[PDB]
Write an enzyme that holds these catalytic residues in place. Structure first.
Site, PDB file in Angstrom:
ATOM      1  N   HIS A  71      10.354   6.692   6.359  1.00 25.34           N
ATOM      2  CA  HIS A  71      10.416   5.102   7.097  1.00 25.34           C
ATOM      3  C   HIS A  71      11.723   4.531   8.100  1.00 25.34           C
ATOM      4  CE1 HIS A  71      10.167   0.720   7.071  1.00 25.34           C
ATOM      5  NE2 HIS A  71      11.706   0.475   6.136  1.00 25.34           N
ATOM      6  N   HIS A  85      11.961   2.942  11.984  1.00 19.89           N
ATOM      7  CA  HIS A  85      13.357   2.499  12.391  1.00 19.89           C
ATOM      8  C   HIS A  85      14.369   2.740  14.041  1.00 19.89           C
ATOM      9  CE1 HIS A  85      13.522  -0.768  10.198  1.00 19.89           C
ATOM     10  NE2 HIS A  85      13.349  -0.079   8.693  1.00 19.89           N
ATOM     11  N   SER A  88       5.526   2.988   9.734  1.00 19.30           N
ATOM     12  CA  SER A  88       5.359   4.201   8.969  1.00 19.30           C
ATOM     13  C   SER A  88       4.249   4.384   7.940  1.00 19.30           C
ATOM     14  CB  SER A  88       7.698   3.994   8.035  1.00 19.30           C
ATOM     15  OG  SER A  88       7.632   3.021   7.188  1.00 19.30           O
ATOM     16  N   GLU A 114      10.892  -5.183  10.609  1.00 21.26           N
ATOM     17  CA  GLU A 114      10.048  -4.163   9.458  1.00 21.26           C
ATOM     18  C   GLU A 114       8.349  -4.823   9.697  1.00 21.26           C
ATOM     19  OE1 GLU A 114      11.450  -2.392   7.244  1.00 21.26           O
ATOM     20  OE2 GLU A 114      13.675  -2.861   7.233  1.00 21.26           O
TER      21      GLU A 114
END
Ligand SMILES: Cc1ccn(-c2cc(Cl)ccc2[C@@H](Oc2cc(-c3ccc(C[C@H](N)C(=O)O)cc3)nc(N)n2)C(F)(F)F)n1
Ligand SMILES: [Fe+3]
Length: 275
Positions: free
Chosen positions: A154, A159, A218, A199
């Site tokens: 993730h 990110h 992700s 996010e």
């Protein structure tokens, strides 16, 4: 009175430590590495197991099939840079130290290994100094499509590629800077705006809906779900967006669309003054 907040990058030492048999010991191992980490230390290099590498390889391989049609232009721009300098491959899990060094050259961002969830205040406080707290473990092999908590996949696939983008880097830090010493109510509002942008955000590029939400980028299943057309979509508006409930262990009930990163940035600047 004002609650404690970091005044320099090294101060993050004081907030970073908040909180299947073989898997549990493996997870404790990663937690131990993050717990004993201090600012200035090189992020400990980890030899990932084949199951972990195969898990990364599965997620990585499948997501790359979706990124050209789903991910925003900036994501697609920086992702090849990561594979050319940080070893992004199906057979190799990138080291947090290497990508951290990459981000330093690109946007001055850095990575700090974290055991698990930090409070939104502590987490956003890291962003104020362009530090991103990253988990170092890999998700369980049972479900590579989705996981109810952050893993190194993730962080690395969701990110990192956007943190290499100056406009997005600035956007993230300003959310963090706004959070410093702010009231509990303000931090939560900021945390929700962070949630539905960084996010789980969507953006409009050339008339198309694209994904820049890290939690989406992700997750194989939710990434498809977000742009399927079966999802609820609203324009990003901080006063309204911050009132939306953040869900865990599930797909989000609604996604917010920003016009651009600088647009999301400007809307936030206006909003932080109000709180
Ligand atoms: C208001 C506010 C803002 C933040 N919080 C908060 C505070 C704490 Cl202490 C704990 C939990 C949360 C929030 O939950 C999450 C989750 C995730 C997340 C993202 C990706 C993936 C992997 C993906 N599913 C994949 O499959 O790859 C997993 C998790 N990220 C964030 N930033 N928050 C919550 F609870 F609000 F929703 N509260
Ligand atoms: Fe995240």
């Amino acid at each position: 009175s004002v609650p404690w907040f970091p005044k320099k990058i090294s101060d993050l030492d004081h907030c970073a430590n908040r909180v299947d048999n073989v898997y549990r010991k493996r997870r404790k191992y990663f937690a131990d590495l993050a717990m004993n980490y201090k600012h200035g230390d090189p992020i400990p290099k980890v030899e990932f197991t084949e199951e972990e590498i195969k898990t990364w390889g599965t997620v990585f391989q499948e997501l790359n099939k979706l990124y050209p049609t789903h991910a925003c232009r900036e994501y697609l721009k920086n992702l090849p840079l990561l594979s050319k300098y940080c070893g992004y491959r199906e057979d190799n899990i990138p080291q947090l130290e290497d990508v951290s060094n990459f981000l330093k050259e690109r946007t001055g961002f850095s990575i700090r290994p974290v055991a698990g969830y930090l409070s939104p205040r502590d987490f956003l406080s890291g962003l104020a100094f362009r530090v991103f707290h990253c988990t170092q473990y890999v998700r369980h092999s049972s479900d590579p499509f989705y996981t109810p908590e952050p893993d190194t996949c993730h962080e690395l696939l969701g990110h990192v590629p956007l943190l290499a983008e100056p406009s997005f880097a600035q956007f993230s830090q300003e959310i963090g800077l706004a959070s410093l010493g702010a009231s509990e109510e303000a931090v939560q509002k900021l945390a929700t705006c962070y949630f539905f942008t960084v996010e789980f955000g969507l953006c409009k590029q050339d008339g198309q809906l694209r994904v820049f939400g890290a939690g989406l980028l992700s997750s194989i299943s939710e990434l498809k779900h977000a742009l399927s057309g079966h999802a609820k979509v609203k324009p990003f508006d901080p006063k309204i967006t911050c009132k939306q409930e953040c869900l865990i262990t599930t797909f989000q009930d609604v996604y917010f669309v920003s016009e651009s990163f600088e647009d999301a940035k400007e809307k936030m600047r206006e909003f932080t003054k109000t709180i």
